Amino acid sequence: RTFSYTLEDHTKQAFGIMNELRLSQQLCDVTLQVKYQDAPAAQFMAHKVVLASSSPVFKAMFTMEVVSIEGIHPKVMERLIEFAYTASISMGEKCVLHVMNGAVMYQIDSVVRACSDFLVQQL
């Protein structure tokens, strides 16, 4: 006989700690330098493996590093990184399209679908 065990919300709890570590800027191996039209420059520290596990684009990119990012608004990038680390994303009704464009850019299909589904309803 063999004993087997599964903790249901382990992944959720471990992501909570992973998110904590990102805010404390601990164990981070990538710094995203985001520049975009008009908007001020911004830096976001993260863990390559966490981003990679949420975005095929990020996974391709990585398989301390400073990465220059263009063509995406810093606040959009912020919301997508937050999604990677928390499984949740929120945005103002009037910017749903902008977030979708970032999501499409980094192939985060669930966010893409969600924004699309919402925008279809808005007409």
Ligand X SMILES: *[C@H]1C(C#N)=C(O)[C@@H](C)[C@@H]2CCc3c(OC)nc(C)nc3[C@@]12C
The footprint of ligand X (CB under 6 A) covers 73, 75-76, 79, 91-92, 94-95, 98-99
**45 CB contacts (<8 Å, ≥6 apart)?**
22, 25, 28, 30, 31, 32
Stretch that binds a second copy, among 26-34, 36-44, 65-73 (CB under 8 A): 26-34
Residues in 55-114 at the binding interface with a second copy, rule: CB under 8 A:
59, 62-63, 83-84, 87-93, 96, 110-111, 114
CA distance linking residue 83 with residue 1, whole number of Å: 41
* Alpha-carbon separation of residue 70 from 67, 74, 107, 116 (angstroms): 10, 9, 16, 23
Q: How many residues does the structure list for the chain? A: 123
CA distance linking residue 19 with residue 87, whole number of Å: 11
Asked if 25 is part of the footprint of a second copy (rule: CB under 8 A), the reply reads no
Nearer to a second copy, 5 or 70 (CB): 5
What, of a second copy, ligand X, none, does residue 72 touch, CB below 5 to 8 Å by kind?
none
Q: Which residue lies nearest ligand X, judged by its C-beta? A: 92
On the CB side of 57, CA atoms within 13 Å amount to 11
- Which residues would be at the binding site for a second copy (CB under 8 A)? 1-8, 10-15, 17-18, 21, 26-27, 29, 47-50, 52-54, 59, 62-63, 83-84, 87-93, 96, 110-111, 114-115, 118
